[PDB]
Amino acid sequence: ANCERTFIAIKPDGVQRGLVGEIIKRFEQKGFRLVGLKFMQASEDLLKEHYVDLKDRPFFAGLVKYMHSGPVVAMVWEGLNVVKTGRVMLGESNPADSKPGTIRGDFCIQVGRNIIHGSDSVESAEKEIGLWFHPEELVD
Amino acid sequence: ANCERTFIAIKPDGVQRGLVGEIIKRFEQKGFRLVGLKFMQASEDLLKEHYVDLKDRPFFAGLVKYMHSGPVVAMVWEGLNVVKTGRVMLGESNPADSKPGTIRGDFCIQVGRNIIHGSDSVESAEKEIGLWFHPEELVD
Amino acid sequence: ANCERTFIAIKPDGVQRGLVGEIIKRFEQKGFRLVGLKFMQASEDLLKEHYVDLKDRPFFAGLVKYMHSGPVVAMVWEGLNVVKTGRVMLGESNPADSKPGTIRGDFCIQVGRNIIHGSDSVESAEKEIGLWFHPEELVD
Amino acid sequence: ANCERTFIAIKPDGVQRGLVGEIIKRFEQKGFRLVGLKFMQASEDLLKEHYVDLKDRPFFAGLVKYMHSGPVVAMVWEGLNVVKTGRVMLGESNPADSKPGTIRGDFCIQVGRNIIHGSDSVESAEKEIGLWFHPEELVD
Amino acid sequence: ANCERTFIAIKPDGVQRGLVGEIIKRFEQKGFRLVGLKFMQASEDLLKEHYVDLKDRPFFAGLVKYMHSGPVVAMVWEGLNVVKTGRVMLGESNPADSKPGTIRGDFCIQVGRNIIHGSDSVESAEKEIGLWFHPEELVD
Amino acid sequence: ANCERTFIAIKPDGVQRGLVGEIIKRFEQKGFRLVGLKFMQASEDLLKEHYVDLKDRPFFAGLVKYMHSGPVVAMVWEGLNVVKTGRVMLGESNPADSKPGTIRGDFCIQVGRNIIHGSDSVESAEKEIGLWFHPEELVD
């Protein structure tokens, strides 16, 4: 009914600069609850199936090394229609078309090293959280 | 010329959670002045003519009891074309289509228990303030 | 047990500049609840018994006219030992000795036209709220 | 490649009220760097070629006197496609169509005394900075 | 030299209300880096050795059940003399003597259900992080 | 009477990280006005008489090169007893004794590369502004 769970991630640029506080705020003050917050670098074992559909791209190697550069923060949120709300409130991956008020539209400049990744659909969200978060990791 | 006066209200959810500070801020820092700020629960004598046009709705009783649950904050603002500016800066009552940067688009999740009510037109504003604020209550 | 109620007021400088949002915030985010929020100019009928103990001062007339200049906001808060917490979090009336982080220590410059008035003791608070807020005005 | 430089200015209303901090913030936290920040009133020698294309307007004299009223802040920013990003993040000069989240859409009320001026194109930016900032004034 | 690591925790009140964003901010904007951020409820296996020195207290059972009520956030920070800086910037556990500007002095009201726990000494910090964070959990 | 003018500067760390917005805010929202805001790197011609009294120190060369590393922002403020208010609101140069709520007590970690420099006395302020700001640079 209202137990839909999404996933939000922080790129190495976000942490090397340091913005996680407001990133958490934009969901916390909204009303969405968090069930899982894990910190890691994820190595390369998980940054192959996460972008498995993007493996046939020229930028796959460079971008995956860019993500692998440093540690990355992982969050899981739940709320009514949360998946759609997150993507629009995050903003388009291309800063050129990114209205003010969205996280990616307020801290991201270039398409290359973007800041935030989020699930487009419920199936993607559940698959990703299964890949990353063990069932005991989450809470209620 | 520039004496147009509007009305903004706070639902019981807004106060039971507590957000009135930023709600006031979004108008105060804008430049609009306030002429009236009264706090009450309004009983049921005023929550019948306020939604008199919505009396023929299945959700009228439940929603009016939800509003009657706790006390509600009432504000009056004035400014150039303030009525139109308030509604757009507040955001659509449906969070599904609510761009970031609007009060209802930054703290409201579900259509049922919305947060903010505002006058759609000048006539509605004047009728409501007559229903709620006595002429001596306001200031200049 | 925890029903102690205090009083906080806004000088005409605070509103003519406009700072009520953060003033409300500093108590709202703290956890204190509000039972009464009334807006008025208070005329001169209430600005004689409020400072009745200060009537024998050279600055009484000038300061009371300064307060009477414009409308003033009145608030009532409740919380555990709220009266003591409010005064320290407000800061000393003299900005010269006013540590950062207090409302009067972050927006007030000169002793003359100070910004915030608050009850020093429970008896003063109850007397003032009786003078200003009628029993039906407050809520629970 | 990424050395494109723009220009942002502060109207006398912005400083007489005082908002330069958040105005700087909206670009600083974004990632854009600043190469030049000069404070002056600019007299009337520069407020004739800045609006030379607007000289044939009925409001030219009144608006130029309004700008000449007080001192004005001048800033220069650089970033990828910064010129386009600044104008959209600033918001339309007409507050009537100004979505929330933009500087002009969050602090400006009337078209007459607007708050922020910015370069529409690279050529305008370079011409203006040549008119205002001497080459030694800027930094790298 | 500068690798000293501390520990900060969030009580169930902090999350059930929701304040983790600003709590993270107060350290992130300061300059301290984080090496570990894990979310759990910790059961009762870890809330016996954490307060082993407080086992001989009348409030031990009630307080440990209060902490066990909900999930709790765990953070680890590193910086020059970070342990001392954290405790003073957090504020005294007793709100009665808690100057404004400290996290516990800006969101905590009563001694009973306090908000933040932090290591008093380096030895306590290392013992606690050994109890909670596995060596592979942390990063560099 | 109230025309006392002080000086505040931004170290290269402050700009290379980027914090000038809040630094300006802490004075702007207070009420102090600014008469001069110039941006430069100042070369070494001015970073010899500024610290002429500190020339007989072992850290003079290293610290002066650290300041010379990048450009530095210069500001001038005026207000009632502004010089004393600035220094206390800035906080002690040593972060070890720096209460929360002060700029240096909220963003500085180590004594070596401090963030903010300010005039201790009126004579120092006037001498410094004479060294840096030409009389025509300032405004009224």
Residue numbers in the entry:
A (entry chain C), B (entry chain A), C (entry chain D), D (entry chain B), E (entry chain F), F (entry chain E): 2 to 141
Article sentences:
Nucleoside diphosphate kinase A (NME1) is a multifunctional enzyme that was found to be pyrophosphorylated on Thr94 in human cells. A major role of NME1 is the synthesis of nucleoside triphosphates, other than ATP. NME1 catalyses this process by transferring the γ-phosphoryl group from ATP to a nucleoside diphosphate (NDP) via an active-site phosphohistidine intermediate.
For this, purified pS94-NME1 and ppS94-NME1 were vitrified, and cryo-EM datasets were recorded and refined to final resolutions of 2.8 Å for pS94-NME1 and 3.3 Å for ppS94-NME1. Notably, additional cryo-EM density at Ser94 was observed in both cases, which corresponds to the monophosphate or pyrophosphate group. The model for ppS94-NME1 indicates a more pronounced effect, and the distance between the β-phosphoryl group and the N1 of His118 amounts to only 4.5 Å. Further efforts to visualize the link between both side chains by comparing the maps at the same threshold showed that the densities for the His118 side chain and the pyrophosphate group are forming a bridge in the ppS94-NME1 map. The structural data suggest that the β-phosphoryl group of ppS94 is optimally placed (within 4.5 Å from His118) for a nucleophilic attack, and in closer proximity to the 1-pHis118 intermediate than the pS94 residue. This observation is corroborated by the biochemical data, which showed that ppS94-NME1 was much more competent to undergo oligophosphorylation, compared with pS94-NME1. The assay for ppS94-NME1 revealed that the pyrophosphoprotein exhibited almost no NDP kinase activity, even at a protein concentration of 1 µM. This ‘hyperphosphorylation’ was dependent on the catalytic His118 residue because the kinase-inactive mutant ppS94-NME1(H118F) did not undergo this modification.
